[PDB]
Design a protein around this nucleic acid. Structure first.
Lengths: 97, 95, 103, 87, 105, 93, 97, 87
DNA sequence: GCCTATCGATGTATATATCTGACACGTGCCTGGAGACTAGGGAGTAATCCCCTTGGCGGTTAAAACGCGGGGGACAGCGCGTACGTGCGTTTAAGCGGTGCTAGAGCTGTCTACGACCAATTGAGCGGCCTCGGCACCGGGATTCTGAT
DNA sequence: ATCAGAATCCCGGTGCCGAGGCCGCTCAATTGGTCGTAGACAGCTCTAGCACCGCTTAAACGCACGTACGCGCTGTCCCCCGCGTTTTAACCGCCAAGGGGATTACTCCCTAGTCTCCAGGCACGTGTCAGATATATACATCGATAGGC
């Protein structure tokens, strides 16, 4: 049986996604999630096709720049695993609450 | 000489309505003078972009109401609409 | 005077002059600065209501710049509005984290 | 199998390998397991702060359609300015 | 000539910028020297970015400029990274970046 | 209908610098957003400077003291040089 | 007598957070403010309020750095902040890239 | 003792117990020793970014005196708005 | 007990080959930039004004500096053990296209009410003056912790 | 839980100077009439949005194995804290200007303003090659047990 060492598929995975430039989250579950958040504020809201897309790019790059800034805290604890105390640190330093 | 304008008497009038037995240092009086001009530049600075996005050229009472609900957080915006709309409604009925 | 015809304290005309001379629009409607002075008046009446409570919390009658720092930072909805503003002669809130106290 | 479907909560639409693909772009080799309950809470509290601004621009313009620049002019309020989507 | 962009020796417009200063409610009296100055500073910034994009666009061997090239240029140059500090570019990817702790030895 | 853009003016600069390089529409719509985004950064700053100094006008000098505020060290020192080359050739014309 | 290590510093933190005045010495600060003016334009003058306002935006930036730094050096299972902690806490805020 | 004085570098004017008093306000119990060489480098790189804006406001207004609002209008450029110093 | 080794095993890189899509390019055309002119006031300039910033000295007084001793912490190494990654087969809904209507955006066209504009008038709101009491202030006695037993 | 010890905490007496009124006074708010533009409103095409199905095909789902992390442990070194005591520069106070901020009044050029005009710059069609996609093809790296040190 062939099986890589655990911790080597992720290294080839990182060097694939930093070369690609497409959207990782799919367009349909993100479309249905946006509609349920607006329903608490206003009923009967249509959406343009670009406003689902243009919400998505500013939702992904907020996560990747968060996942860039919760990675360094895990290296700061001499770790690799980004345990969820790192994110609630990494939003505190950027002032987001 | 130089005659500067301020918000000196207007804050001290308001403080006496909600606290009669209360003074205020001039060092704190420079804060609320600079606090109001920070807020009023932030609201009217947002009201300029609202009328410009819809290609209009008039700040009416509506754009402030859609600038107050933008800047202010969740709880404070529900008060300043209610305080704001009551002020115009007493102003429109009066002469 | 429009400050009393709407039943306010802040000057309507001084704000209304600051919306025309300030070049915030070409035209300024008459409904705008009467609405604007009340928004400033409630927000000023919100700050001193929590500032003056800090005066009786330390048994003083005048407001120094410490008590404004105590009101805005303890409040949760006023702190989101002024999250980046620093206040001169204010200090910080008294907080000690849990691992720093002696066992 | 069918008597009633699951109809899950629409926040689990941002699926577990989808979040994992985001951390691989963000330069993370090894991810925890409790983070998948956390980062849905981050994105739900983030899209709340944008769509609240996106409605109030559209509610002022007397429309029913949150267009492209009712998001871009809402993002510029938050300081995270977007490009590419015109204007 | 007649056009002001030739008379300033530029390519960006001037009369369009001069209208887009006046109707933008910036000040009462826009001076006529400022759209000559403003169209130049807009040119040099576009001449900075489009030159840096096609450098990296040649390295992936493509004739056209794609938004991946524009993300790759303005995040590489430190003097452009300080200007576009909090701007999200659509279709950007990231800079290739793995830290030295996660690598095997 | 009619939509004012910058797509021709980014293109002529592109043929001035990289004379064999095309540009996609998605890349062109970034610069058309980017050119407009430097505008309200500069003109929004030059408007704030003239109101602060009790003036009521925007000359070519207020742009020069707004460019040095925004752009960094190596970028602003060349923009003021290329700006002053543009105004002097206009006032000579 | 000889106090233990720890209850002296925890009397300082209870004392300085109650107080509200300047903790950096005035004349060494205004010799610092004047000496970085020479790198941009020589022969400048300063009002006595302008190096007072420049202290209160210098004091309230280090305090709001050390409060962010102490939450980092807590997180790495330590009690002592370090120069490696500051360069992390400046990296996440976007000041130092 | 006098033949020539030390005339130290004016960045050591922000003295070692002064920095220590700042960390005690910031809720730090125990401080390192190598931090005193570090935090002078932070304050020197911070006052450079404010005074560069403070000069350019004054250089435009044809003055020689960096007043109070050539600092407050320089700090508002950086987003760290100051209060209390008038206007 | 270790470096090398050498495998096929999966994985990318590179190769040409073929082709679809947007990319430029040409056209007609219309809105908006340019030429031209003249009136007004903002900005330039000079001049005079008096604050207020820079200078250093004297003295003083508490912070800063220097050193030491010790102990608490950073530090690394160890052994645990679970919660991760990995891979497989299995199941599922995203993708895609494709119908279906119609709200709703965007458009022109009216039309009138609103706010700019200007002049006339006076008092709210400024600076300056003035006085009194809130808080700094210390000293003592009273307390609450602290370390040591 | 006890003991004595330094270090806040308060109570009170003092007093000083900043806030609190007071008054006069002027720029500016208000009242008023005039007015033409923006904007509200109504009517109108029609493009793009939403809803379902139909269908292929991929990613998501789940499960087991295990292994490399996370994790807590001990021990050890030292780099810190804390006190004690000289030392020095900061704070305060003052002398001593004089540059420059900020005041005035004046002059004029430059901008806004309307007017007339005329192509630069638009939308839209239109070929066409530049990348999309691929399969092949070679060449890498990757563990793995193999060999010999």
């Amino acid at each position: 049986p062939h099986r890589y060492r655990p911790g080597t598929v992720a290294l080839r995975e990182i060097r694939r996604y930093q070369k690609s430039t497409e959207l990782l989250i799919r367009k349909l579950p993100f479309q249905r999630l946006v509609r349920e958040i607006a329903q608490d504020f206003k009923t009967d809201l249509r959406f343009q096709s670009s406003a689902v897309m243009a919400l998505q790019e500013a939702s992904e790059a907020y996560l990747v720049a968060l996942f860039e800034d919760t990675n360094l805290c895990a290296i700061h604890a001499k770790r690799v695993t980004i345990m969820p105390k790192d994110i609630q640190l990494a939003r505190r330093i950027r002032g987001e609450r | 000489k130089t005659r500067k304008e301020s918000y000196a008497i207007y804050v001290y009038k308001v403080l006496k309505q909600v606290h009669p037995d209360t003074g205020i240092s001039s060092k704190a009086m420079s804060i609320m003078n600079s606090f109001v001009n920070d807020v009023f530049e932030r609201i009217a600075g947002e009201a300029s972009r609202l009328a410009h996005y819809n290609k209009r050229s008039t700040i009416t009472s509506r754009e402030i109401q859609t600038a107050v609900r933008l800047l202010l957080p969740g709880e404070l915006a529900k008060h300043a609409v209610s305080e704001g709309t009551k002020a115009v409604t007493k102003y429109t009925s009066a002469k | 005077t429009r400050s009393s015809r709407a039943g306010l304290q802040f000057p309507v005309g001084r704000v209304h002059r600051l919306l025309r001379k300030g070049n915030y629009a070409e035209r300024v409607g008459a409904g705008a600065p009467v609405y604007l002075a009340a928004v400033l008046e409630y927000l000023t009446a919100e700050i001193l209501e929590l500032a003056g409570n800090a005066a009786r919390d330390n048994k003083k009658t005048r407001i120094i710049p410490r008590h404004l720092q105590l009101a805005v930072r303890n409040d949760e909805e006023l702190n989101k509005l002024l999250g980046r503003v620093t206040i001169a002669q204010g200090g910080v809130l008294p907080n000690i984290q849990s691992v720093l106290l002696p066992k | 199998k069918r008597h009633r479907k699951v109809l899950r909560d629409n926040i689990q639409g941002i699926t577990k390998p989808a979040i994992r693909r985001l951390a691989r772009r963000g330069g993370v080799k090894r991810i925890s397991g409790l983070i998948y309950e956390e980062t849905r809470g981050v994105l739900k509290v983030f899209l709340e702060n944008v769509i609240r601004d996106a409605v109030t621009y559209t509610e002022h313009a007397k429309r029913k359609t949150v267009t492209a620049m009712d998001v871009v002019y809402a993002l510029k309020r938050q300081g995270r300015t977007l490009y590419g989507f015109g204007g």
